[PDB]
């Protein structure tokens, strides 16, 4: 039950990794509503670079769409489509 080396390497390099993101992290102004679910799974550039002076940044982005329940407390609700940004290609780059 001990992970190999070159496994940890590839399992860890700057690449699109699924991430749980708060909706209000994406739509900070919508403070009048509340959302269920309150967060969403999105590919974001994750993992590390092989050099201090680098940073794991996206080189390809694409919004994606999911069904969220918008709720205006004491006035109603409904389930609408919300678009969210995603990373497709990641890249280590100078900082």
């Amino acid at each position: 039950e001990v992970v190999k080396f070159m496994d940890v390497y590839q399992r860890s390099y700057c690449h699109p990794i699924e991430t749980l993101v708060d909706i209000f992290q994406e739509y900070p102004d919508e403070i009048e509503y509340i959302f269920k679910p309150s967060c969403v799974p999105l590919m974001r550039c994750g993992g590390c670079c092989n050099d201090e002076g680098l940073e794991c940044v996206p080189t390809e982005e694409s919004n994606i769409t999911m069904q969220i329940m918008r709720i205006k407390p004491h006035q109603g609700q409904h389930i609408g489509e919300m678009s969210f940004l995603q990373h497709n290609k990641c890249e280590c780059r100078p900082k």
């Binding site: 209000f24 900070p28 102004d29 403070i31 009048e32 509503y33 509340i34 269920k36 679910p37 329940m69 709720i71 205006k72 407390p73 004491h74 006035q75 609700q77």
Partner: protein, 185 residues
């Protein structure tokens, strides 16, 4: 095809999913998600009535995302539609904009007014201003901020400034008077 079930911040209330059935005595329970739990009558607090539905006090499920009743009947098991659990608040403890005290300004001087509402949790908040702007969310207590901004301030902007916050079924407001003086001398 789903249902919806609201809950107040002051829990410990009692709730009824309309799991309505004919058989006066069924082995009917209430499964939940999430996390996957599954509740059963006990007479005291919990119960399911044939024509009343499944019963349970709010705080017993307020954490879940959706519940549904399910009946074990021999061959297969049959269940109701999905009801979505929704906790909501309304309590606005106070609203106060910085600064509270008066304001004497000078023409052209940038003006920024922070308006701050402290609410309980699961509160949604709408801001509304009265006067001659951007807002964001931030203990069992929330804080929403609404910041009004003007740069080129004229002499006419020298009016009373009003922020009001509505939580849905409640509303509070605070204010402050500001005067726009002309560059002195």
């Amino acid at each position: 095809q789903h249902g919806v079930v609201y809950i107040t911040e002051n829990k410990n209330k009692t709730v009824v999913i309309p799991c309505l059935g004919s058989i006066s005595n069924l082995n009917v329970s209430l499964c939940a998600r999430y996390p996957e739990k599954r509740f059963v009558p006990d007479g005291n607090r919990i119960s399911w009535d044939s024509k009343k539905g499944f019963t349970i006090p709010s705080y017993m499920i307020s954490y879940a995302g959706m519940v549904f009743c399910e009946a074990k009947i021999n061959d297969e098991s049959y269940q109701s539609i999905m009801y979505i659990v929704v906790v909501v608040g309304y309590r606005i403890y106070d609203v106060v904009l910085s600064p509270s005290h008066g304001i004497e300004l000078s023409v052209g001087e940038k003006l920024v007014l922070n308006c701050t509402a402290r609410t309980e949790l699961n509160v949604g908040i709408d801001f509304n201003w009265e006067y001659p702007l951007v807002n964001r969310d931030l203990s069992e207590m929330k804080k929403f901020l609404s910041t009004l901004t003007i740069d080129g301030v004229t002499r006419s902007d020298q009016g009373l400034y009003t922020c009001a916050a509505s939580s849905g079924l409640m509303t509070k407001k605070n204010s402050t008077f500001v005067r726009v003086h002309e560059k002195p001398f």
